[PDB]
Amino acid sequence: GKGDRRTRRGKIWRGTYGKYRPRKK
Amino acid sequence: PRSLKKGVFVDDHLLEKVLELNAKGEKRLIKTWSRRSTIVPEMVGHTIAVYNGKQHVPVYITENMVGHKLGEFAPTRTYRGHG
Amino acid sequence: MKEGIHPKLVPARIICGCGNVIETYSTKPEIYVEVCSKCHPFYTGQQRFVDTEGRVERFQRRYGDS
Amino acid sequence: PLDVALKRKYYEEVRPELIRRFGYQNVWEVPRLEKVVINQGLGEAKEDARILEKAAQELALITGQKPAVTRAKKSISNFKLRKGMPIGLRVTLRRDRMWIFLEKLLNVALPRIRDFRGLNPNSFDGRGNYNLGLREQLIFPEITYDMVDALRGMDIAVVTTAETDEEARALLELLGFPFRK
Amino acid sequence: ARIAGVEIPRNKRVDVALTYIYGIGKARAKEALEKTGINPATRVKDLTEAEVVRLREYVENTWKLEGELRAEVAANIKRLMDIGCYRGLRHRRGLPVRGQRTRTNARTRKGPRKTV
RNA sequence: CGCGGGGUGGAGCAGCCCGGUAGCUCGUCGGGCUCAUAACCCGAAGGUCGUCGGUUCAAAUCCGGCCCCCGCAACCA
RNA sequence: AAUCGCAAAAAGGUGGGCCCAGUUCGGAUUGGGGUCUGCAACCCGACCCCAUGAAGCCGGAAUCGCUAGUAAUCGCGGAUCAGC
RNA sequence: GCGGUCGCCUCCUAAAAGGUAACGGAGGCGCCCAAAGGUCCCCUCAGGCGGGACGGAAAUCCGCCGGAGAGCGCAAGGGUA
Ligand SMILES: [Mg+2]
Ligand SMILES: [Mg+2]
Ligand SMILES: [Mg+2]
Ligand SMILES: [Mg+2]
Ligand SMILES: [Mg+2]
Ligand SMILES: [Mg+2]
Ligand SMILES: [Mg+2]
Ligand SMILES: [Mg+2]
Ligand SMILES: [Mg+2]
Ligand SMILES: [Mg+2]
Ligand SMILES: [Mg+2]
Ligand SMILES: [Mg+2]
Ligand SMILES: [Mg+2]
Ligand SMILES: [Mg+2]
Ligand SMILES: [Mg+2]
Ligand SMILES: [Mg+2]
Ligand SMILES: [Mg+2]
Ligand SMILES: [Mg+2]
Ligand SMILES: [Mg+2]
Ligand SMILES: [Mg+2]
Ligand SMILES: [Mg+2]
Ligand SMILES: [Mg+2]
Ligand SMILES: [Mg+2]
Ligand SMILES: [Mg+2]
Ligand SMILES: [Mg+2]
Ligand SMILES: [Mg+2]
Ligand SMILES: [Mg+2]
Ligand SMILES: [Mg+2]
Ligand SMILES: [Mg+2]
């Protein structure tokens, strides 16, 4: 959920990047 | 958690007075206003008086307070329960 | 012992982090124990694995040189 | 079965190392093991015997003896309990059958205790006997985890012929008892 | 089958059945899988006794878990309190340790309301 | 000092026979409706049972002593 | 700076996994290890990673919004601004 | 008169046999048990200390100490391992 910083959707919500949402297009 | 490292920030005015107390070897009450700084292992055994905004509180020092700051031992609260 | 009303109790086998425990002498011969800490695994044969005592020491060395 | 690894280890290992350590003039003076009493305090079964037989089922499976069902000596309100009612389960295992039981207790059970850094070195009752309390009946090899319905431990009372527990300590030590020093 | 201390997981899957251990999360689990060379997709319900023992020894030896971990945590807290640390005397009062506002929404750490 | 009935949340009442769990109304507290208070609606807290001893496994409850309350009696003289 | 960069749009779409489980739901709290801004993150910053996994299974009396590209739902940007 | 009492058991009063009075000091009975009965065989308490998961003053267990202070359906007495 948008509150689980340990996931894709969570990371998007906060607007940041990391292991669970890497910067790679 | 928490971090800042690759610097380990400690104020001078006390660090100088702490060192100047190891050489000559003299342990005495040392008043400070710097709670922004880390502690020891060169202060271990000194009674530094930390400031809580109101007045200096004498704080014993042991080798397990090392990693922390000085303010963590001089609370700014005064609570004493409710009701 | 009284006749009937009893478990058989018979020479048995056993398994662990070790290899084998022939002794046994119990009902249901041949058993697979999670970890017999008698063979040498765990605490005895004081392994002290995943050793510790970071605490002071840890913040000490990342401090002496930071 | 009159072999048993521990029964062997007592005579040809423990017994001699005990003599040269205390200097027993006679042959009998040296501490022998006798009588190991296992007792489940089971108030858990106040008004339901159905749960008391499943326990006995279990106790005999790990010991090799059907246990006797103790009954309440007196009526004691506060926590129910009147002069009757099955309020406990107890079995007294002696020579041989005690040996095979005490062996698995050391080489399997205790090892399976979550945590465990040794048994209490103060449970000696002064006159040279040792008591210990277990917190669940799954640490014994005979138990399958799929036969349980609820966790219930027990009291274990080991009795020794040793007049002092200073000596009673050595016996249990040399037998392979994991003490917390 | 029993792994750390005890804790018997089962069915569902293998990468999740490891999470049910105290000290193991999505990472530490999904890692030891391809480090002991085993397929997570399968269920602990079915797997060679061999695979079973690679796990227990790997995991139970790689790090500390269940009892050992818990024991270390409560041990760090004891120190924080023992020393007079603010971060520590917020453990005596059972209040939120990391900043936050206690004027309100502090329940989780403060407990159900005691209306007055 | 005769006889009878009592004493239980803050108020007034049950529960005591027959043992084993204390209930009702009001009030109090928190929230709601209202511009607002009350009414009204939704929630919650609160009594060791006058007292000391006794009986029983267990006492508001059965038994005894003491202290208070109410009622009746104190006649021939 | 339509001539570079923030920039990935998100839901959607395809494929696959979970199979009703306080559960790969939910991410609170907490332990540990770090990054960055700033003279300085104890009180009092944000962020990452490991572990922890909380209350919550749809909310009493009450009560709000909205008539169409509206309500719902999805992401993006800006001001302030060292960071937040 | 009013009040209390009226038969039965226990204790004291009762003066070391029995018995013995008073509106003398205190309690209890108007049942109960098909086993709480007969016999044979076994068994021995209460407490106190130490020991032992959930067990707490006290549930069940082990150790030593424990002549009866326990128990004997209910009062008291006598009796009794
Ligand atoms: Mg949503
Ligand atoms: Mg999630
Ligand atoms: Mg200067
Ligand atoms: Mg905050
Ligand atoms: Mg009345
Ligand atoms: Mg009243
Ligand atoms: Mg009545
Ligand atoms: Mg009301
Ligand atoms: Mg109100
Ligand atoms: Mg009275
Ligand atoms: Mg009686
Ligand atoms: Mg009373
Ligand atoms: Mg007349
Ligand atoms: Mg951006
Ligand atoms: Mg819940
Ligand atoms: Mg989850
Ligand atoms: Mg559900
Ligand atoms: Mg309109
Ligand atoms: Mg935004
Ligand atoms: Mg900004
Ligand atoms: Mg009359
Ligand atoms: Mg006489
Ligand atoms: Mg006794
Ligand atoms: Mg005792
Ligand atoms: Mg005791
Ligand atoms: Mg008697
Ligand atoms: Mg009698
Ligand atoms: Mg008598
Ligand atoms: Mg007598």
Side-chain angles (χ1 to χ4, degrees):
Chain A
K2 298 186 250 186
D4 200 355
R5 328 174 93 187
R6 281 198 190 180
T7 42
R8 183 70 70 178
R9 266 265 202 72
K11 225 70 164 177
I12 304 178
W13 184 87
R14 314 214 88 85
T16 58
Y17 300 97
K19 174 174 185 173
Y20 301 92
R21 187 219 190 188
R23 225 189 305 249
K24 173 60 200 305
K25 110 124 298 183
Chain B
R2 273 56 191 177
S3 177
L4 56 81
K5 42 142 272 47
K6 184 242 273 54
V8 175
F9 319 68
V10 55
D11 272 23
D12 298 326
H13 55 275
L14 76 168
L15 183 52
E16 177 171 354
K17 181 60 176 181
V18 176
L19 289 170
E20 193 160 356
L21 264 43
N22 304 127
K24 169 188 276 67
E26 249 58 77
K27 314 163 206 166
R28 42 86 70 85
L29 55 308
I30 161 181
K31 293 195 299 294
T32 177
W33 275 262
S34 193
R35 54 200 298 101
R36 12 138 50 148
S37 51
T38 320
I39 176 187
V40 301
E42 347 256 332
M43 315 169 178
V44 285
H46 280 356
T47 315
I48 304 176
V50 186
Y51 195 64
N52 58 17
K54 187 179 179 66
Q55 68 183 217
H56 308 289
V57 303
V59 44
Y60 28 81
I61 304 186
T62 67
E63 61 162 326
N64 60 134
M65 321 184 181
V66 175
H68 309 279
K69 314 286 186 169
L70 285 194
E72 302 198 52
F73 300 80
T76 43
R77 320 184 308 173
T78 304
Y79 177 60
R80 198 162 20 184
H82 239 161
Chain C
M1 303 193 310
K2 271 303 181 187
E3 196 64 58
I5 217 71
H6 266 280
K8 181 61 181 179
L9 199 97
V10 141
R13 284 277 187 263
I14 253 180
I15 320 179
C16 106
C18 48
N20 196 37
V21 179
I22 186 182
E23 196 279 339
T24 56
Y25 286 111
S26 74
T27 38
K28 185 170 56 180
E30 302 176 27
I31 307 179
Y32 187 90
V33 145
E34 123 219 52
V35 172
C36 77
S37 299
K38 275 14 234 170
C39 1
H40 265 187
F42 146 106
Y43 163 91
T44 305
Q46 200 65 62
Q47 289 195 204
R48 191 59 166 178
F49 68 153
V50 197
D51 36 33
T52 167
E53 220 273 332
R55 202 182 57 96
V56 167
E57 137 63 17
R58 169 51 182 168
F59 225 102
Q60 285 281 12
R61 266 43 279 187
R62 68 143 279 181
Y63 192 116
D65 48 86
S66 288
Chain D
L2 294 75
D3 211 332
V4 186
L6 204 87
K7 183 180 182 182
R8 196 173 199 97
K9 194 237 204 67
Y10 165 69
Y11 299 101
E12 62 174 30
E13 203 157 0
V14 165
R15 203 152 208 276
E17 181 67 27
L18 237 164
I19 311 172
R20 81 161 203 75
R21 277 191 50 176
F22 291 96
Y24 302 103
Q25 82 92 9
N26 193 284
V27 213
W28 295 94
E29 297 189 20
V30 25
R32 301 95 72 185
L33 251 189
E34 73 144 320
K35 182 183 182 184
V36 153
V37 183
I38 307 173
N39 169 261
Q40 293 196 154
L42 252 44
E44 0 262 274
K46 256 155 296 190
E47 209 72 312
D48 182 38
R50 193 178 42 81
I51 229 66
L52 184 82
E53 53 192 0
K54 170 53 190 177
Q57 162 67 9
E58 292 178 348
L59 241 184
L61 201 53
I62 114 180
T63 270
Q65 284 194 221
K66 15 75 273 208
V69 41
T70 43
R71 325 201 81 126
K73 294 205 63 178
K74 67 175 62 177
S75 299
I76 191 133
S77 192
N78 297 36
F79 239 84
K80 268 46 62 186
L81 220 264
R82 55 188 63 257
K83 196 190 198 304
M85 283 187 303
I87 205 59
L89 224 47
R90 185 280 306 268
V91 57
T92 293
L93 37 164
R94 289 159 184 266
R95 74 154 155 283
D96 235 30
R97 235 180 295 93
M98 72 162 298
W99 288 114
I100 119 278
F101 170 87
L102 247 181
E103 193 126 29
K104 294 186 293 290
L105 173 61
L106 293 186
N107 305 112
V108 167
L110 289 176
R112 310 181 77 181
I113 299 297
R114 50 198 78 271
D115 273 74
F116 187 26
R117 286 83 201 280
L119 302 161
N120 199 118
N122 303 84
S123 304
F124 289 90
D125 60 27
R127 260 140 289 94
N129 315 275
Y130 187 85
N131 298 274
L132 70 158
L134 288 51
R135 286 175 182 169
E136 80 175 22
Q137 70 290 20
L138 258 175
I139 61 176
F140 299 100
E142 291 82 357
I143 317 305
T144 62
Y145 181 95
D146 304 327
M147 58 183 299
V148 288
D149 58 326
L151 294 187
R152 42 186 169 270
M154 73 210 68
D155 293 323
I156 305 176
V158 2
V159 186
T160 295
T161 79
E163 301 146 312
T164 88
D165 50 339
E166 212 257 316
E167 321 181 49
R169 169 61 186 275
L171 170 54
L172 295 182
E173 253 296 16
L174 305 165
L175 280 168
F177 270 16
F179 287 78
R180 214 194 313 108
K181 314 311 170 186
Chain E
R2 309 208 170 194
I3 305 193
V6 173
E7 305 199 54
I8 295 191
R10 202 185 205 91
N11 203 319
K12 273 182 168 296
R13 217 172 189 83
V14 171
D15 47 321
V16 225
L18 271 294
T19 58
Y20 280 159
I21 313 294
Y22 180 66
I24 297 179
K26 258 188 173 63
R28 287 191 164 184
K30 297 169 181 290
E31 174 266 3
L33 270 286
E34 52 187 0
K35 288 277 291 185
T36 64
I38 310 183
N39 182 21
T42 61
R43 325 304 175 96
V44 21
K45 193 171 189 177
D46 52 270
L47 77 179
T48 299
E49 320 296 58
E51 321 185 69
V52 171
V53 192
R54 279 212 297 283
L55 269 303
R56 183 144 64 267
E57 293 203 351
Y58 187 90
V59 187
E60 199 173 352
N61 289 94
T62 299
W63 26 53
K64 63 172 59 182
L65 304 179
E66 188 231 47
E68 196 170 7
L69 224 189
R70 245 188 308 273
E72 187 185 58
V73 191
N76 286 11
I77 328 295
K78 178 160 180 54
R79 194 188 59 89
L80 278 166
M81 307 190 198
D82 279 24
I83 204 54
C85 180
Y86 166 94
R87 200 262 216 89
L89 60 76
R90 296 288 294 181
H91 279 89
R92 313 168 177 264
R93 299 288 155 267
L95 288 178
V97 192
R98 308 174 171 178
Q100 291 151 132
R101 50 144 38 177
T102 53
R103 189 205 186 109
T104 93
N105 306 118
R107 273 47 216 80
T108 299
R109 172 84 182 160
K110 194 171 178 173
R113 350 200 68 96
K114 304 178 297 267
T115 323
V116 294

